[PDB]
Design an enzyme around this catalytic site. Structure first.
Site, PDB file in Angstrom:
ATOM      1  N   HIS A  62       0.809  -1.221   0.000  1.00 20.26           N
ATOM      2  CA  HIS A  62       0.000   0.000   0.000  1.00 20.26           C
ATOM      3  C   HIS A  62       0.849   1.281   0.000  1.00 20.26           C
ATOM      4  CE1 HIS A  62      -4.046   1.661   0.348  1.00 20.26           C
ATOM      5  NE2 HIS A  62      -3.617   2.533   1.253  1.00 20.26           N
ATOM      6  N   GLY A  68      -0.242   5.697  10.976  1.00 17.77           N
ATOM      7  CA  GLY A  68       1.215   5.594  10.897  1.00 17.77           C
ATOM      8  C   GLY A  68       1.796   4.280  11.374  1.00 17.77           C
ATOM      9  N   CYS A 112       1.094   1.254  10.169  1.00 14.13           N
ATOM     10  CA  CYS A 112       1.190   0.273   9.088  1.00 14.13           C
ATOM     11  C   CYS A 112       2.624  -0.267   8.996  1.00 14.13           C
ATOM     12  CB  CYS A 112       0.722   0.969   7.782  1.00 14.13           C
ATOM     13  SG  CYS A 112       0.314  -0.028   6.380  1.00 14.13           S
TER      14      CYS A 112
HETATM   15  C1  LIG Z   1      -6.201   4.321  12.973  1.00 13.65           C
HETATM   16  N1  LIG Z   1      -5.373   3.213  12.531  1.00 13.65           N
HETATM   17  C2  LIG Z   1      -5.106   2.065  13.162  1.00 13.65           C
HETATM   18  N2  LIG Z   1      -4.301   1.300  12.424  1.00 13.65           N
HETATM   19  C3  LIG Z   1      -4.163   2.035  11.294  1.00 13.65           C
HETATM   20  C4  LIG Z   1      -3.296   1.553  10.196  1.00 13.65           C
HETATM   21  N3  LIG Z   1      -3.285   2.382   8.994  1.00 13.65           N
HETATM   22  C5  LIG Z   1      -2.285   3.338   8.858  1.00 13.65           C
HETATM   23  O1  LIG Z   1      -1.381   3.484   9.661  1.00 13.65           O
HETATM   24  N4  LIG Z   1      -2.335   4.057   7.693  1.00 13.65           N
HETATM   25  C6  LIG Z   1      -3.283   3.962   6.699  1.00 13.65           C
HETATM   26  N5  LIG Z   1      -3.249   4.619   5.597  1.00 13.65           N
HETATM   27  C7  LIG Z   1      -2.193   5.539   5.367  1.00 13.65           C
HETATM   28  C8  LIG Z   1      -2.433   6.906   5.393  1.00 13.65           C
HETATM   29  C9  LIG Z   1      -1.369   7.811   5.174  1.00 13.65           C
HETATM   30  C10 LIG Z   1      -1.242   9.204   5.129  1.00 13.65           C
HETATM   31  N6  LIG Z   1       0.062   9.459   4.885  1.00 13.65           N
HETATM   32  C11 LIG Z   1       0.674  10.774   4.746  1.00 13.65           C
HETATM   33  N7  LIG Z   1       0.832   8.352   4.756  1.00 13.65           N
HETATM   34  C12 LIG Z   1      -0.044   7.334   4.929  1.00 13.65           C
HETATM   35  C13 LIG Z   1       0.213   5.945   4.872  1.00 13.65           C
HETATM   36  C14 LIG Z   1      -0.829   5.084   5.132  1.00 13.65           C
HETATM   37 CL1  LIG Z   1      -0.461   3.352   5.083  1.00 13.65          CL
HETATM   38  N8  LIG Z   1      -4.316   3.058   6.981  1.00 13.65           N
HETATM   39  C15 LIG Z   1      -5.376   2.845   6.001  1.00 13.65           C
HETATM   40  C16 LIG Z   1      -5.097   1.676   5.074  1.00 13.65           C
HETATM   41  C17 LIG Z   1      -3.879   0.995   5.024  1.00 13.65           C
HETATM   42  C18 LIG Z   1      -3.711  -0.055   4.132  1.00 13.65           C
HETATM   43  F1  LIG Z   1      -2.551  -0.739   4.085  1.00 13.65           F
HETATM   44  C19 LIG Z   1      -4.736  -0.448   3.290  1.00 13.65           C
HETATM   45  F2  LIG Z   1      -4.512  -1.461   2.432  1.00 13.65           F
HETATM   46  C20 LIG Z   1      -5.955   0.212   3.306  1.00 13.65           C
HETATM   47  C21 LIG Z   1      -6.097   1.260   4.202  1.00 13.65           C
HETATM   48  F3  LIG Z   1      -7.280   1.914   4.243  1.00 13.65           F
HETATM   49  C22 LIG Z   1      -4.342   2.250   8.117  1.00 13.65           C
HETATM   50  O2  LIG Z   1      -5.239   1.437   8.320  1.00 13.65           O
HETATM   51  N9  LIG Z   1      -4.762   3.214  11.301  1.00 13.65           N
END
Ligand SMILES: Cn1cnc(Cn2c(=O)nc(Nc3cc4cn(C)nc4cc3Cl)n(Cc3cc(F)c(F)cc3F)c2=O)n1
Ligand SMILES: Cn1cnc(Cn2c(=O)nc(Nc3cc4cn(C)nc4cc3Cl)n(Cc3cc(F)c(F)cc3F)c2=O)n1
Ligand code: NA
Ligand code: NA
Lengths: 301, 301
Positions: A41, A143, A145
């Site tokens: 992702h 953050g 992930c």
């Molecule tokens: C609240 N929470 C609990 N666990 C998570 C895990 N998670 C995450 O950390 N980040 C995600 N999306 C990103 C947004 C970004 C914005 N910037 C600047 N960089 C980013 C990088 C990421 Cl990875 N997500 C959402 C998400 C991550 C995926 F790998 C996926 F396949 C689908 C998704 F909807 C997330 O769930 N957040």
């Protein structure tokens, strides 16, 4: 004595965590030998976070679009490939802190430690179970992930989970070969977790831990059979108990001299009458996130 | 037109199958580049087929205890290692017939082709589905251990299943990284498959195939909603239907102009009244081993 939610010491994993940036997407990766593993992702932007075509996206990239930071030290990406839902970044430096390791896929009911990370930086450690519906009830913010879950056997780290997303309050990810736990996909669709159930063998292991620690009030003189128990367990949304489960509890039956089917009789009573304002090991609910092996490791060391 | 249980052409896999013998245990293996993959159970004899300690057993072996036959040609084992439940035999010759391939783990409801093999020799090909309880309803005799399941995408073979055992009439195995499908272990214990359920999305895809082929008698003018349908589906031991399932059926709704929830209404009626001595695509039961993508591939080619 005493009984706590205990995690594995995380030192060996902490030295493998790195930060990965592609464009404006940053997240964590796992650096072992000369490969960085991270969720695929990371190659998305907002435009394609709802229905990405990862093979297309990855074609359009070059090694230099990937920024890998190991603390301050920048690592040079010299190759990339996709495996299922992870990315493998080949880099020019093998991690000198690479422990002995392997990649294993765990089953529902098993437990592992999670090292929660932000920007490549370890933030905390906690123990959790893979639920019967293939999610984990973790604690993760934006953050996180790429954070990983692991067990330690001897000197060997078994990596078993890489965090990808949160779905309605619970968390979903893959094994380290990039295969999802459960029926989820790494995009945004209408996906929800299925109905969860209570892990019975784990509840029984925890009742044994209670007896070892001196909580005996729930015991009784009756016995039962697997069939009568599983008939009651089903009514309360408890996994059915098998003969293999009975065998795994062997060592704890032995140490306490309480037979499994004897302890099932106590469990049956707890399910029908409740605890009535008494506690077991400091909890007022039946706890299911401790495996027979967790109890042994913590109560016999 | 017409509709058959169609498998993928197996030529690309046939050239990878080999025979592996260790002592008096013989079975099949999969030869890709310079590695032979086979079930680790091949290192057991009768003494340890009930509770083996595979790490011990493998310590006691040398490369020359492994006899690998590629037809007549004998291959030299120059190294071995264990990965979860498979054995990886490093050999001195890379298979020149190695197709483009990858190792993928499939989800319940997905289908694949099985190339059943005995003594390293391909014997037959058939199509089957991974069931919701993580077994497959295959057709296998003694000696079939190590047979593989696969899909073809373009020119690429995706290996997804390696056969290990039969449990009460059905079959269990691992992915090619050696991780079991389902809660099974490669020994003899008291292990049985859990309750199976009918794969609803697949039943709906098959009803679309029927319409495309001119079987229309079950259609009706009513509609329904996901909630009312899933309420009935649960009563009959059918997987619940999600919005993603509805979306996957899109192309078939399009081609026939029958909306998914329209077709759900027909399914609801079939479940409540039966078929009453009528057939659909030559069957008197609702068939659930054809995916939306199988139908498209066979009905639009
Ligand atoms: C609240 N929470 C609990 N666990 C998570 C895990 N998670 C995450 O950390 N980040 C995600 N999306 C990103 C947004 C970004 C914005 N910037 C600047 N960089 C980013 C990088 C990421 Cl990875 N997500 C959402 C998400 C991550 C995926 F790998 C996926 F396949 C689908 C998704 F909807 C997330 O769930 N957040
Ligand atoms: C009827 N059926 C349907 N599928 C199967 C698969 N299967 C098989 O082919 N062989 C097995 N055991 C062996 C016996 C041997 C006797 N000789 C001389 N060599 C032998 C090699 C094998 Cl592998 N089994 C049993 C089995 C195989 C496992 F890999 C395992 F982990 C547990 C098991 F009980 C078998 O199921 N037979
Ligand atoms: Na009792
Ligand atoms: Na209708």
């Amino acid at each position: 004595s005493g009984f706590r939610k205990m995690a594995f010491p995380s030192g060996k994993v902490e030295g493998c965590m790195v930060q990965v940036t592609c464009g404006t997407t940053t997240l964590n990766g796992l650096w072992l030998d000369d490969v960085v593993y991270c969720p695929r992702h990371v190659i998305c932007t907002s435009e394609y976070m709802l229905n990405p075509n990862y093979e297309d996206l990855l074609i359009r990239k070059s090694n230099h679009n990937f920024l890998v930071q190991a603390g301050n030290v920048q690592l040079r990406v010299i190759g990339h490939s996709m495996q299922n839902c992870v990315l493998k970044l080949k880099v020019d430096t093998a991690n000198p802190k690479t422990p002995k390791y392997k990649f294993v896929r765990i089953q529902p009911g098993q437990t592992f430690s999670v090292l929660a990370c932000y920007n490549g930086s370890p933030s905390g450690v906690y123990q959790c179970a893979m639920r019967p519906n293939f999610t984990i009830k973790g604690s993760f913010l934006n953050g996180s992930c790429g954070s990983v879950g692991f067990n330690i056997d001897y000197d060997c780290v078994s990596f078993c989970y890489m965090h990808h997303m949160e779905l309605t309050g619970v968390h979903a990810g893959t094994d380290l070969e990039g295969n999802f736990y459960g029926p989820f996909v790494d995009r945004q669709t209408a996906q929800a977790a299925g109905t969860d159930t209570t892990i019975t063998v784990n509840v029984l292991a925890w009742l044994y831990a209670a007896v070892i620690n001196g909580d005996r009030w729930f015991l009784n003189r009756f016995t039962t059979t697997l069939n009568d128990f599983n008939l009651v367990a089903m009514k309360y949304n408890y996994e059915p108990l098998t003969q293999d489960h009975v065998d795994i509890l062997g060592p704890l039956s032995a140490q306490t001299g309480i037979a499994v089917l004897d302890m099932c009789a106590s469990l049956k009573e707890l399910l029908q009458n409740g605890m009535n304002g008494r506690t077991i090991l400091g909890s007022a609910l039946l706890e299911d996130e401790f495996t027979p092996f967790d109890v042994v490791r913590q109560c016999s060391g």
